[PDB]
Amino acid sequence: TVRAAGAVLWRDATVEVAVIHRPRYDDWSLPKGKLDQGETEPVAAAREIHEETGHTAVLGRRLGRVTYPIPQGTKRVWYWAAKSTGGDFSPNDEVDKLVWLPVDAAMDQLQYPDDRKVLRRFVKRPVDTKTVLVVRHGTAGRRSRYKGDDRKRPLDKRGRAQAEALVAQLMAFGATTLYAADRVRCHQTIEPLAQELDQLIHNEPLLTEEAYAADHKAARKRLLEIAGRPGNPVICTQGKVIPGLIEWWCERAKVRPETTGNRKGSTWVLSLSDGELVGADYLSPPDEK
Amino acid sequence: HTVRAAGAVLWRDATVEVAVIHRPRYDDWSLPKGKLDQGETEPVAAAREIHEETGHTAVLGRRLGRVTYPIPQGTKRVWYWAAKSTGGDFSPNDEVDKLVWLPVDAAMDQLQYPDDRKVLRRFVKRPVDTKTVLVVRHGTAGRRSRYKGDDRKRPLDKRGRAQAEALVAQLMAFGATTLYAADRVRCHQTIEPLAQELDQLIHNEPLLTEEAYAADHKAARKRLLEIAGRPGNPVICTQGKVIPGLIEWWCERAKVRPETTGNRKGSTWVLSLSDGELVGADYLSPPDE
Ligand SMILES: Nc1ncnc2c1ncn2[C@@H]1O[C@H](COP(=O)(O)OP(=O)(O)OP(=O)(O)O)[C@@H](O)[C@H]1O
Ligand SMILES: Nc1ncnc2c1ncn2[C@@H]1O[C@H](COP(=O)(O)OP(=O)(O)OP(=O)(O)O)[C@@H](O)[C@H]1O
Ligand SMILES: [Cl-]
Ligand SMILES: [Cl-]
Ligand SMILES: [Cl-]
Ligand SMILES: [Cl-]
Ligand SMILES: [Cl-]
Ligand SMILES: [Cl-]
Ligand SMILES: [Cl-]
Ligand SMILES: [F-]
Ligand SMILES: [F-]
Ligand SMILES: [F-]
Ligand SMILES: [F-]
Ligand SMILES: [F-]
Ligand SMILES: [F-]
Ligand SMILES: [Mg+2]
Ligand SMILES: [Mg+2]
Ligand SMILES: [Mg+2]
Ligand SMILES: [Mg+2]
Ligand SMILES: [Mg+2]
Ligand SMILES: [Mg+2]
Ligand SMILES: [Mg+2]
């Protein structure tokens, strides 16, 4: 019942991680806290890291889910690896001490078994990763009811709201460059993000459902091309293209999706290290759980 | 006596090429296969033998039936799978000195044994680039009338715990990626050893309990289809009065004939799908039967 998110916030020492002390429970733990209304887990994680540690951070690989019982029902915390991009700590509302420890010492500092389990996930794969964000376009009504060229079918009111809600989510992962398939609804999905970054959306005719249907290899090739460029790209496409591209890349690399889906407005976070896939994390559409 | 063995048509994208192995002990060209070790199931032996004989890691898909042939000791019985290579390189080993990759036509020429040719004929009959849905009946769990608590909480017994452990290698041979269990403790516990191995959560599925299925079998079918449509190879652990019904419905819709059948606790149905359509339904006995 109670949804939360947090992080292993790290910095280059080789790495040190942040362990926080809170007076209420006199505990040592990883920074995390509750989703506010309208936030998704990554949005909440980045926010809570800032509030509890004073550091700005960019989320990378997901580090699984923790659940435990509380007074208000059940607590569920999703965790991310999060690289500090700077900031400074000062005792605040929730937290009065913060220590940066190398992993072995941090393991001994962390008193909850689940936090230790999260830290063990953290060290099991590279954490200095780049991120490709594959997004299914937002809701766009029904083909049946669109009088016009279906390629031009726009987002509906709900999908416009999904597009706005996606900016904070995608920014949590340090999105830098934007790409969309050659359909109105894919471009509109990331046009709020484009404004926020003052970036142009590159058009990708090779990544439409039609194009992929006739040459899937050209599309795979384009994806790796895009992935190879500097930065963390966002690629917004249609439903029939995503599953094929995600399964292809996952089995290549023996990466397993803990969660999975393909809903309108959903995001796959693909984490790469030295060009090799090290995570594939499926995020629900920003207005579903 | 009868010697139990298992193997595969190991293949990769060229459009497929298949692996044909040479063995100095008989100067033969054949498909990778070997004997079941103590307490091993057929699929676990096939995946192991593939790796030992070819150097490749692989994921098993559709079952290709069985062959029997005379040997000095009596009778050799070999079950076969289609298996997609997921990487590795061949190097000469204790059993195999050479490996060649060939298109199917040329493989049929290279394979000197009629029964290997029978198997390769079965392989080309249906698609092999398939997604796999693994439907598992929970392991043994005592009985309802001797359990004091709410029956939803009744746990696996000792034998059921052993079945759960033995399923890990069973389900990994088929490249399980994503985990689901009906809303009963005993279903979760059947896949908890796999969940520990993969370090992943188990999705809870209230629509897939016996009581939900009885009240709304359509919602159960729909939910199965939803799960089967997402990226990855899902494992779904459910109950004895749900499985037959789901498997019969799907086989009857797709006109798929299962070679074997059953519904025992700890058993697995391997459902192979090509473009969303069912192309195989392979019943695997519980790993301890
Ligand atoms: N990772 C954990 N595993 C097990 N128990 C925990 C964990 N973190 C906190 N607790 C315990 O659970 C209770 C609630 O603490 P928790 O930090 O979840 O709630 P909170 O104060 O509302 O903070 P937040 O806003 O950061 O979610 C306390 O008894 C605490 O010791
Ligand atoms: N597919 C087959 N059809 C007919 N005869 C075969 C076949 N494969 C092997 N043989 C022959 O059967 C005998 C036993 O060979 P086989 O490969 O079954 O057993 P093995 O040497 O124990 O190897 P494995 O451990 O791979 O089963 C040999 O004479 C061999 O030439
Ligand atoms: Cl649509
Ligand atoms: Cl077009
Ligand atoms: Cl299209
Ligand atoms: Cl959707
Ligand atoms: Cl039972
Ligand atoms: Cl049984
Ligand atoms: Cl079907
Ligand atoms: F918090
Ligand atoms: F919080
Ligand atoms: F908080
Ligand atoms: F062998
Ligand atoms: F063998
Ligand atoms: F062997
Ligand atoms: Mg907080
Ligand atoms: Mg809080
Ligand atoms: Mg907190
Ligand atoms: Mg908070
Ligand atoms: Mg052998
Ligand atoms: Mg062998
Ligand atoms: Mg052999």
Ligand SMILES: [Mg+2]
């Ligand atoms: Mg052997």
